[PDB]
Amino acid sequence: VDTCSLASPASVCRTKHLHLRCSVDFTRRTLTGTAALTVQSQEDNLRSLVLDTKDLTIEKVVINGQEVKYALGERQSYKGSPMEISLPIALSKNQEIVIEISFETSPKSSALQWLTPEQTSGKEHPYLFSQCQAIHCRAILPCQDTPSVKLTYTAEVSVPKELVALMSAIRDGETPDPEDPSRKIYKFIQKVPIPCYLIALVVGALESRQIGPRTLVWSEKEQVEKSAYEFSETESMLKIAEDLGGPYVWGQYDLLVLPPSFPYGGMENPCLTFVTPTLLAGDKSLSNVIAHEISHSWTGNLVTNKTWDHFWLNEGHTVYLERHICGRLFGEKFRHFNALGGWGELQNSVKTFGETHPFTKLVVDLTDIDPDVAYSSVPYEKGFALLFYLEQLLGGPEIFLGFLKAYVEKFSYKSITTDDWKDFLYSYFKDKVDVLNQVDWNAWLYSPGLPPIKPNYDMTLTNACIALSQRWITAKEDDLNSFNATDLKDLSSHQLNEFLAQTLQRAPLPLGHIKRMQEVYNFNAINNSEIRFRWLRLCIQSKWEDAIPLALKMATEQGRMKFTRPLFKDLAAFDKSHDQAVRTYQEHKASMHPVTAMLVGKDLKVD
Ligand SMILES: c1ccc(Oc2ccc(-c3cnc[nH]3)cc2)cc1
Ligand SMILES: [Yb+3]
Numbered sequence: 001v002d003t004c005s006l007a008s009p010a011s012v013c014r015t016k017h018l019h020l021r022c023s024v025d026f027t028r029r030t031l032t033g034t035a036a037l038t039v040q041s042q043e044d045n046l047r048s049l050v051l052d053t054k055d056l057t058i059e060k061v062v063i064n065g066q067e068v069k070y071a072l073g074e075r076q077s078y079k080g081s082p083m084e085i086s087l088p089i090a091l092s093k094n095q096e097i098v099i100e101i102s103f104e105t106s107p108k109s110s111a112l113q114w115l116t117p118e119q120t121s122g123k124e125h126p127y128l129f130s131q132c133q134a135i136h137c138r139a140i141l142p143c144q145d146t147p148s149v150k151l152t153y154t155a156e157v158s159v160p161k162e163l164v165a166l167m168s169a170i171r172d173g174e175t176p177d178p179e180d181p182s183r184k185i186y187k188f189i190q191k192v193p194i195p196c197y198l199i200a201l202v203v204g205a206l207e208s209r210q211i212g213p214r215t216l217v218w219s220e221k222e223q224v225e226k227s228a229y230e231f232s233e234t235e236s237m238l239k240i241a242e243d244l245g246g247p248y249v250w251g252q253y254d255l256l257v258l259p260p261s262f263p264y265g266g267m268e269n270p271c272l273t274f275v276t277p278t279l280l281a282g283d284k285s286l287s288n289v290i291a292h293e294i295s296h297s298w299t300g301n302l303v304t305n306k307t308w309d310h311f312w313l314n315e316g317h318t319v320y321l322e323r324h325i326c327g328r329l330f331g332e333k334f335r336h337f338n339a340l341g342g343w344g345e346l347q348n349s350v351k352t353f354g355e356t357h358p359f360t361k362l363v364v365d366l367t368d369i370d371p372d373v374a375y376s377s378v379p380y381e382k383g384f385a386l387l388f389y390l391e392q393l394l395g396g397p398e399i400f401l402g403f404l405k406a407y408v409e410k411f412s413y414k415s416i417t418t419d420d421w422k423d424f425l426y427s428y429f430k431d432k433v434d435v436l437n438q439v440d441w442n443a444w445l446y447s448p449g450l451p452p453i454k455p456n457y458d459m460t461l462t463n464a465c466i467a468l469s470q471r472w473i474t475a476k477e478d479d480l481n482s483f484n485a486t487d488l489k490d491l492s493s494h495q496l497n498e499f500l501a502q503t504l505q506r507a508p509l510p511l512g513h514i515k516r517m518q519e520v521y522n523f524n525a526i527n528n529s530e531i532r533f534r535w536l537r538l539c540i541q542s543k544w545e546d547a548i549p550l551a552l553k554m555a556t557e558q559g560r561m562k563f564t565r566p567l568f569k570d571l572a573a574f575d576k577s578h579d580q581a582v583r584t585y586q587e588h589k590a591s592m593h594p595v596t597a598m599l600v601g602k603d604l605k606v607d
């Protein structure tokens with residue numbers, strides 16, 4: 001039972017294939033076309049079925065060349081409206097039919113962001129991008145919008161000829177549009193069965209540069225060169241991931257660097273990972289996001305969560321693999337450093353939500369909950385902590401990686417629950433069941449708050465961050481002169497970020513301390529988005545008025561939710577910037593990504 005979907009479940013019927021034929025209309029801000037769904041009946045005498053839709057305009061439904069009856073139910077908030085389709089003939093079990101739905105998206109589709117030329121790098125062309133995870137595919141096309149159903153797809157997308165279209169699929173050619181010479185049709189093929197949240201589309205003035213044997217980086221021309229350098233470790237990370245998870249089955253691994261309003265750090269769209277331009281630090285320091293997206297090619301894209309209640313399966317295992325890739329490239333001491341950092345991020349999420357909050361549970365119950373509202377570090381970090389705890393309990397990383405590879409092999413091309421995962425863990429580790437029976441499963445999986453046990457972490461790389469953070473926290477006015485730029489000479493950008501995170505956990509600090517920190521460290525000059533984000537939060541929470549224009553600029557010049565949401569919340573909580581935070585949000589609301597706009601609105605209590 002997928003409580004986030006209004007469609008017929010996989011026990012009734014299953015979509016096997018989607019053939020999408022659409023046109024991108026920038027003037028109307030609509031995608032117009034036909035979604036031809038190959039549906040297989042799982043029941044005898046099947047006469048109707050239900051699909052998910054959200055703000056879609058349906059023109060007609062054609063089956064076997066004839067128009068059929070359909071009805072749209074009442075809208076159920078963020079779940080959208082169920083579409084019931086009357087089949088022209090009753091279907092036997094395993095019988096297939098093609099249902100061709102003519103539709104148009106709304107300009108306010110929650111899956112899409114339409115950008116005017118002014119909102120892009122080049123300033124001459126418009127731009128469009130999609131983001132389906134978790135339940136926004138229904139706001140693009142009618143579908144069984146549930147990760148419990150996997151389908152292949154083909155697509156033909158008509159766009160203005162001066163633009164390029166890309167999808168989460170293999171590029172299958174381009175031709176002039178035979179119905180409009182001012183347009184081009186780009187073709188796509190996704191031969192590997194995927195859940196529909198993995199369907200993705202981008203249309204804009206895109207250029208590409210090859211960075212590996214199976215990787216192109218795509219972006220507007222202005223970002224191509226910086227992107228090619230930033231993500232140069234991609235091929236080496238793909239090779240390590242294959243060693244850990246088995247063959248890469250997707251063919252190509254391309255990267256698309258989106259405009260700054262992209263709401264997430266990355267999105268694992270198959271064949272075409274989408275990334276935030278906030279990774280463009282100039283030193284490859286934020287490349288763990290690429291390692292994370294690459295890992296999803298196994299954990300999430302091959303083995304998928306059956307419902308959103310089991311999303312931790314996707315994230316926990318991906319973070320676990322991501323940390324091993326970075327560990328193979330930079331050492332085991334670095335893997336422990338990132339892991340311990342992740343525990344800190346989990347402490348933060350638990351503190352923010354509250355230790356009894358249901359969203360702090362590993363397995364959640366999303367009935368009547370908008371998944372976008374539940375989104376946090378919890379499934380990532382509590383999921384990772386569980387796996388890291390199990391690794392230590394079970395004999396170490398080599399042993400636990402053996403389980404991960406077998407797990408991916410066992411469940412490839414399937415959608416699974418937490419019970420399916422636990423059963424296989426027990427089956428794989430049959431000779432260690434007595435060890436497994438010591439795990440407090442009810443607490444780990446179903447209880448809110450911090451996990452019952454904290455794993456063991458090597459402290460080598462963390463020690464200098466903790467030492468410097470503690471020097472600042474315990475410093476009195478007569479100690480401020482003892483700080484100097486030399487305090488940072490032996491710290492990597494990762495350690496600098498960790499020093500800020502540690503200090504931020506004890507914020508506010510006195511205003512004189514924060515002013516001294518700028519004087520000696522010149523943190524205002526740092527472009528690295530992670531570091532700048534934590535430094536600006538530290539300044540605002542410490543009531544430094546000078547930081548207000550810097551924090552407002554970062555919150556609005558980019559839209560990665562991880563940065564924009566806490567920056568707006570900190571600015572709203574500071575009396576000196578409260579009014580400016582609310583006004584800036586209201587002024588930018590129309591230009592923002594629809595999900596980000598909704599979430600920042602809720603955070604600020606501005607309707
Ligand atoms: C993007 C948007 C929403 C989404 O849905 C969620 C979010 C959080 C959980 C969750 C699990 N434990 C605690 N929170 C589960 C599902 C996933 C991706
Ligand atoms: Yb081809």
Ligand SMILES: [Yb+3]
Pocket residue numbers: 476478479
């Ligand atoms: Yb003193």
Ligand SMILES: [Zn+2]
Pocket residue numbers: 292296314315318
């Ligand atoms: Zn992920």
